[PDB]
Nucleic acid binder design. Structure first.
Lengths: 129, 54, 125, 158
RNA sequence: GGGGACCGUCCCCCGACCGGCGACCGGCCGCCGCCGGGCGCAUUUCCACCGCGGCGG
RNA sequence: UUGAAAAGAACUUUGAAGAGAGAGUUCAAGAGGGCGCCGCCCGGAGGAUUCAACCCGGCGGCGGGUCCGGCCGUGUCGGCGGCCCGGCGGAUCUUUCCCGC
RNA sequence: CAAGUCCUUCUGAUCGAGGCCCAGCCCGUGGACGGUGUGAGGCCGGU
RNA sequence: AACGCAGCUAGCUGCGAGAAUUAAUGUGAAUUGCAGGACACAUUGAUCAUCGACACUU
């Protein structure tokens, strides 16, 4: 049960902010869980998705064991693109299939200056508890 | 037997029927001896057979 | 008190089914599973109930202990019967008539037992 | 004659301490009073609802008279649009005002006598001391001991 | 304005009196019933089938 | 207000086209762009944890003057426990013991 | 800033259905809500 | 209130000749219909938000 008087639980209100959200906010909902190996080593459960991360699909028709890299983070449609997540168009070309970030697992992170700082900040909050 | 100590005027409500056990009351010798015998016989409609023919 | 409790659950109970111009009541130990003051396994000081065993062999006869009326954990003692059908009815009949333990469900208890034994034997095609 | 019930430790067994049954548990059980109190009291947490008092009235419509082969319902003045010439101001007209619009000053709340309100509490508490009524509520208490269930104060510190 | 006494009430011990173990509980003997295990293994008991079988529905 | 996702129908064929016929996508085009005969008895042929009565153990129901405690409803006993052994009230008395004039 | 995308199974996809030594999967001061290819405390934002 | 401002732009929206925005701060790899432009991301920066500096045609 939520006790904060200034946070609403209204269905329409919550939906409106989710569908009408600025991109920098949308990145926060653009979050995916790390695999067990990153989670144990980084002590972090979930991370926002990025343009180049090794990503594994765990739900849907394309669910499998193969590892792929994100190639586009389409924040407008709340989807991302991996290489081998494709289907065959009618004429003959090949198009990507949008997969929601919550339905994938990050197997390798785009280790970067801002990134490296992000994990240790989340991780150091764990030893607080 | 004693009033409430934290309401300043309240005593528990009383009962309109102290012994709410009909079976205990009804099937007791004090009541039974005062009753008349039950009439369990059933008298159904009698078909009027016609005299002067029967 | 049984009569006082009956006037409360007479029309408002979670075990009451009202449907198709018929009424049924589904408390555990209720023979004939009907809404009546007589056939209620909850409001009487003493009740009689028969259920199929945990497995499909025999019946379980449960009757209500006199003392622990407000202690449902130990209020009911259960016994299992796995003898012949004729032996079962003879055994059950003695629990009611000889003990004088509610000698009004005696005929009802045998009927429910006989129905249960029919369900335990295989059904032919 | 109030019996002597036992209190139970957090392990589920009796701790040997006994409490005499409070007299409130033998108060008369009056479901009619409880239902009456519950029905009226549950109305007191409602929030008012009403339609806008202007709804269907910003049209400035006239009745067109009776010399033209139409109904005498008021109709919107003007032309050049769909709304022109359409009925308004009536409960039977699309976009009109509903019959007897709901008002915020409807008597939402009810007050119940303090004695009757407290009477229901005693009746509710007494009914909670009978296992048959509790089962009739479908509360699945067949393996709990001492249906009026009392536990030690160590629970309060959990 | 204090504090006491008295009165009325409950809350307590402590006895003694009657009534009742009540639907507030246990221990003991009695009677009855059931269950489990022994003995009882055969004119008993039980199960299943058959007969164009007899009785009541 | 299509569809989870345009995956929005490649390609072949008739028509000048609009329109079709095949084919294809989709779980779905029936979503194609303003698209959601049974109880007892008789006889026979059979099989089997088997019957009653006894012995042991467990569990219930009923009864026992009160068998024993523990009790319950009482009236009744010392005034027995009181407001620093330890309640609540009184438009009852007072300090002829106390904190105001 | 907590904890299942564990196993078997339904599906087009599932958040669905069963199971989860210890009387009981894991967290619970968190079982409000929303999103995610049904219906989600434990996938994500949050709480 | 009018008139203008987008690479492709009518409306809606935002903006004012610095005209679908400048500066600064926070955030931290996108925007997206197409193309182009980007993008060491600290020898410091896309987008978004905030908004205190600047600017603001009749």
């Amino acid at each position: 049960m939520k006790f904060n008087p200034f946070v609403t639980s209204d269905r329409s209100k919550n939906r409106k902010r989710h569908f009408n959200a600025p991109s920098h906010i949308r990145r926060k909902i653009m979050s995916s869980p790390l695999s067990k190996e990153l989670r144990q080593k980084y002590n972090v459960r979930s991370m926002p998705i990025r343009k180049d991360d090794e990503v594994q699909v765990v739900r849907g028709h394309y669910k499998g064991q193969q590892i792929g890299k994100v190639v586009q983070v389409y924040r407008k449609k709340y989807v991302i693109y991996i290489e081998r997540v494709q289907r065959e168009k009618a004429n003959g070309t090949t198009v990507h299939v949008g997969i929601h970030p919550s339905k994938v697992v990050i197997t390798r992170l785009k280790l970067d200056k801002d990134r490296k700082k992000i994990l240790e900040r989340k991780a150091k909050s764990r030893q607080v508890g | 037997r004693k009033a409430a100590s934290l309401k300043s005027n309240y005593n528990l409500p009383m009962h309109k029927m102290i012994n709410t056990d009909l079976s205990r009351i009804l099937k007791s010798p004090e009541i039974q001896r005062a009753l008349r015998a039950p009439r369990k016989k059933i008298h159904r409609r009698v078909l009027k057979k016609n005299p002067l023919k029967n | 008190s049984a009569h006082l409790q009956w006037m409360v659950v007479r029309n408002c109970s979670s075990f009451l089914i009202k449907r198709n111009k018929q009424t049924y009541s589904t408390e555990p130990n209720n023979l004939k599973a009907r809404n009546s003051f007589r056939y209620n396994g909850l409001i009487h000081r003493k009740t009689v109930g028969v259920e199929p065993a945990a497995d499909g062999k025999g019946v379980v006869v449960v009757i209500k202990r006199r003392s622990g009326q407000r202690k449902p954990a130990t209020s009911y003692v259960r016994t299992t019967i796995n003898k012949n059908a004729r032996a079962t009815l003879s055994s059950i009949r003695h629990m009611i008539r000889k003990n004088k333990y509610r000698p009004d469900l005696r005929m009802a208890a045998i009927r429910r037992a006989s129905a249960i034994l029919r369900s335990q034997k295989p059904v032919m095609v | 004659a109030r019996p002597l019930i036992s209190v139970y430790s957090e392990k589920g067994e009796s701790s040997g301490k006994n409490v005499t049954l409070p007299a409130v548990f033998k108060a008369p059980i009056r479901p009619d009073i409880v239902n009456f109190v519950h029905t009226n009291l549950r109305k007191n947490n409602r929030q008012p609802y009403a339609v806008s008092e202007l709804a269907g009235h910003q049209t400035s419509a006239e009745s067109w008279g009776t010399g033209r082969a139409v109904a005498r319902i008021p109709r919107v003045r003007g032309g050049g649009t769909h709304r022109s010439g359409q009925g308004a101001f009536g409960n039977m007209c699309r976009g009109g005002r509903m019959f007897a619009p709901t008002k915020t000053w409807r008597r939402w709340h009810r007050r119940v006598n303090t004695t009757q309100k407290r009477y229901a509490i005693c009746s509710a508490l007494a009914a909670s001391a009978l296992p048959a009524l509790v089962m009739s509520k479908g509360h699945r208490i067949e393996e709990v001991p001492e249906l009026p269930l009392v536990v030690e104060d160590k629970v309060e510190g959990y």
